[PDB]
Amino acid sequence: MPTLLRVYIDGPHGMGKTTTTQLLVALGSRDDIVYVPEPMTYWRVLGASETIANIYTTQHRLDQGEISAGDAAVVMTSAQITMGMPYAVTDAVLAPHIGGEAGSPPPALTLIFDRHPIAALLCYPAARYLMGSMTPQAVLAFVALIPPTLPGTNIVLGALPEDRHIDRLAKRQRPGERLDLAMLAAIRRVYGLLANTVRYLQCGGSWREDWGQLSGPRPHIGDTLFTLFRAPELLAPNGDLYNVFAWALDVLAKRLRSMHVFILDYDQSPAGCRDALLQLTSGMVQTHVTTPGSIPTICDLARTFAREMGEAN
Amino acid sequence: MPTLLRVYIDGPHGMGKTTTTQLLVALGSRDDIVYVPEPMTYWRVLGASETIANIYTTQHRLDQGEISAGDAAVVMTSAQITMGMPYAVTDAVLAPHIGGEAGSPPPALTLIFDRHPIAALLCYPAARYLMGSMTPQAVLAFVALIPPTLPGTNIVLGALPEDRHIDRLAKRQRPGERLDLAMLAAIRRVYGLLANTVRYLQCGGSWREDWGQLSGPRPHIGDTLFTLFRAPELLAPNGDLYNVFAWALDVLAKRLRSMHVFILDYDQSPAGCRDALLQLTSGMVQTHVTTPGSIPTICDLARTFAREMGEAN
Ligand SMILES: Nc1ncnc2c1ncn2[C@@H]1O[C@H](COP(=O)(O)OP(=O)(O)O)[C@@H](O)[C@H]1O
Ligand SMILES: Nc1ncnc2c1ncn2[C@@H]1O[C@H](COP(=O)(O)OP(=O)(O)O)[C@@H](O)[C@H]1O
Ligand SMILES: O=c1[nH]c(=O)n([C@H]2C[C@H](O)[C@@H](COP(=O)(O)O)O2)cc1I
Ligand SMILES: O=c1[nH]c(=O)n([C@H]2C[C@H](O)[C@@H](COP(=O)(O)O)O2)cc1I
To answer: Which of A13, A174, A276, B285 has the fewest CB atoms within 10 Å, counting from its CB?
Structure first.
C-alpha cells in the first residue's frame, strides 16, 4: 500500500505563493514531487481571451459607473466559470484514484498544487459578492457545485500583514490585471472567513443552531462565511433563508468541514518560506490510491496539465 | 432494508411532460409518491428576475443581430447557471441518503421529478452551443461540473414526431417565452445524442478509441454527443483535443455511463401516457437509504422544495 501527499497552496493574490513553489521544487528533490501550476493558458487563451482582463476591466467599468451591477455581475460570473473549469476537470480525473486518509510512513508521490478549486469556486466569487460585482444567488450556485471533498485535502493558506502584502502586490502585475486595494482587502476577508469556518465547524459548529446570533480562536457564526449570506435577497418574509439557499449552506458545510488547513507565515525570505512549507508538509495527510497503477497516472495527469497550462514553473 | 424509487422525467420542452405527471399523481395513490416540480419560482423570482425571459430574449436579440455572439454567450451562460442551481443543491442534500441499487420488492417511497440536473447542465447548454449562443468551452464547464451520478438514477425521456410535437408546443406558451423551432429542433437533437451515448457507452463504447471515425440501434461515436465537441476551438494543431477538454469528455462519460434511460411514447392520450409511465416504473431501479431515518427526510426535502418552488402541481 502506498500514499500520495497532496498539498493545495492557496490564499489571496500576490502573497509569495508562486514564488515559494518554484523555490520548493528547486531543491533538486527527486521526481517524487509533481508541481502543477495555475491553468493560466486556459485562462488567457484556450478558455476565453484574456479572462483575467475582463474581471479587472469589468470592475473599473463598474466602479467608474459605466455598467449596471447586473452587467458586471453576468460577465464577472462567466469570468469565474471559465476560471474554475480547469481546476474541476482535473479534480474529476484525479478522484477515482483517491483512497482513504492513511493518517500522516512516506508518500511515494507528492503533488504541490498552485491553488485549489474553492479559490475559483468560493473565495473569489465571494469577494466579488462584496465588491458589488457578484450576486448572492450566483455565489451560491458555485457553492452548490463545489465537488465532494476528497480525502487528504491539505490546503495551505497564508499570512502577511496588509501593508507588506500590498507592497508585494505592487512589485509585479499580471497580464491585463489592474491594482485593486478593495478587491485585495476583500479577498483577504474571504480567505479568513473561510479558514475560520473550517476551525469553527471542526469544533462542532452548526450554522443553523448559530443563525440567530447573526440576526442581532474558538470562532463563532460571526467569524464564518455564513455571515455573508445573511443578505436581504436570500431571506424570506419570516427572515429565515429560503430552503433553496438553506440547503446550499449545508452543502458548503460538508465541503469545508473535511479540509486540512494550515497557514504559512509569508513574512520571511523565499528560501525559509519554502523550508517552512516543507515542514508543514510533514504533519499533512496522505492517501492510498484505489488502483495500483494510479500513481503513475496521477503523475502523467498533473504533468500533462502543467505541460498544457503552466505559464509558470 | 427499504428501497426508494427515483424517476427523472425529462426530454425537450413542450412534450406532454408536466401534463402527464399531474395525471400520474392524480390517481389518488397514497402519499408514498412525492412529486417535485420544476424550480420555476427560483427561476422567475428568488434566483433572478425572469431568467426564462433572458434566454428567449437574448436569442431574438442575437438572431436579429443586435449583440455579438460573445454577448449572447455570457448572458446565455448565467441563464444556465441560475437555471440549474436548484436542481443541484437538492441533489446535494439527497445524495447522503442514497445507498446502493438493490436491483428492481416494493419501494417505501417513490420520487417523480420534473427534469433531472443534466437537462440544465448538459442538454440545454449544448443546444445553445448549436444555437450559436453558447461557447464550446462554457458547455464543457457544466460538463466538468455534473455531480457524480448516484445509484438508482432512472431518467425517463420522450418520443413524439416533430410535427405533433411542434403543434403541442404551439398550444401553450411559457412566462416570457417565445416560440423557436430551431431551438426546438436543436434540443430534440441533444435529447437524442444523449439518450444515444448512454446506449453506446453501456455497450462498451469508448470515445477515445472511436475518435478517428469522427475525423473523417447499436450506435457509433457519430451518434454520440461526443461529435459536438469536434469543434475547431477545442482542437490543438495536432488535431487532438487538448487534454483540458479531453479529460472532461471522460468526466462526461462516467456520468452518463451509469444512467437508466427509458423513453415514453408521448403519442397517446394523457391518461394512457401516465399508464405507460406507470408501467415503465416497474422495471426501474430502486435504492436503499444510508440512514434509516433518510426516507422521511427525503420526503420533507422534496416536499419542502415543491412548496417553495413549484408553480406547478
Ligand atoms: N518572501 C518574499 N520576500 C519578498 N518578496 C516576495 C516574497 N515572496 C514573494 N515575493 C514577491 O511579491 C510578489 C507576490 O509573489 P508571487 O509568488 O509572485 O505571487 P503569488 O503569491 O500571488 O502567487 C511577487 O512579485 C514576488 O516576487
Ligand atoms: N397526450 C397529450 N395529448 C394532447 N396534448 C397534450 C398531451 N400531453 C401534453 N399535451 C399538451 O401539449 C403541451 C405540452 O405539454 P406540457 O405537459 O404542458 O409540457 P411539457 O411536456 O413541456 O412539460 C401542453 O399544452 C399540453 O397541454
Ligand atoms: O478565481 C479567481 N479569480 C480571480 O480573479 N483571479 C485573479 C487574481 C489574480 O489577478 C490572478 C491570479 O494570479 P495569482 O494567484 O498568482 O496572484 O487571477 C484568480 C482566480 I483562481
Ligand atoms: O436548462 C434549461 N434551459 C431552458 O432554456 N429551459 C426553458 C425551456 C422552456 O421554455 C422552459 C421549461 O419549461 P418546460 O420544461 O415545461 O417545457 O425553460 C429550461 C431548462 I431545465
So the answer is: A174
Domain range for A74 is 1-313
Q: What angle do CA A114, A118, A123 make, to 5 degrees?
A: 105
C-beta B218 within 6 A of ligand 2:
no
State the Cα–Cα distance between residues B99 and A221, nearest whole angstrom.
32
Q: Tell whether A310 is within 8 A of chain B (Cβ).
A: no
* Span from the CA of B263 to the centroid of ligand 4 (angstroms): 19
Q: What is the CA radius of gyration of chain B?
A: 19
- Rounded Cα gap, residues A131 and A134, in angstroms: 7
Q: For residue B105, what is the domain's CATH number?
A: 3.40.50.300
C-alpha of residue B280 to centroid of ligand 3, in Å? 49
Query: What residues of A act catalytically?
Result: 38
In DSSP terms, which residues pair with A33 in a beta bridge?
A110
* Beta-carbon contacts of residue A19 (< 8 Å; ≥ 6 apart): A270, A273
The CB of A37 under 6 Å from ligand 1? The reply is no
Q: Which residues pair with A311 in a beta bridge?
A: none
Q: Are A120 and A44 in contact (CB under 8 A)?
A: no
Pairwise CA distance, residues B98 & B96, whole Å? 6
Q: CB of A11 within 8 Å of any CB in chain B?
A: no
* Cell numbers standing for residue A241: 433563508
Q: Which residues of B touch A254 (CB under 8 A)?
A: 96
Give the cell for residue A94. 484525479
Distance A280 CA to ligand 4 centre (A): 49
How many folded domains does chain B comprise?
Answer: 1
**Residue A2 backbone class (left: φ over 0; alpha: ψ -120 to 50; beta: rest):** beta
* Experimental method, per PDB record: X-ray
* A33 in reach of chain B (CB within 8 A): no
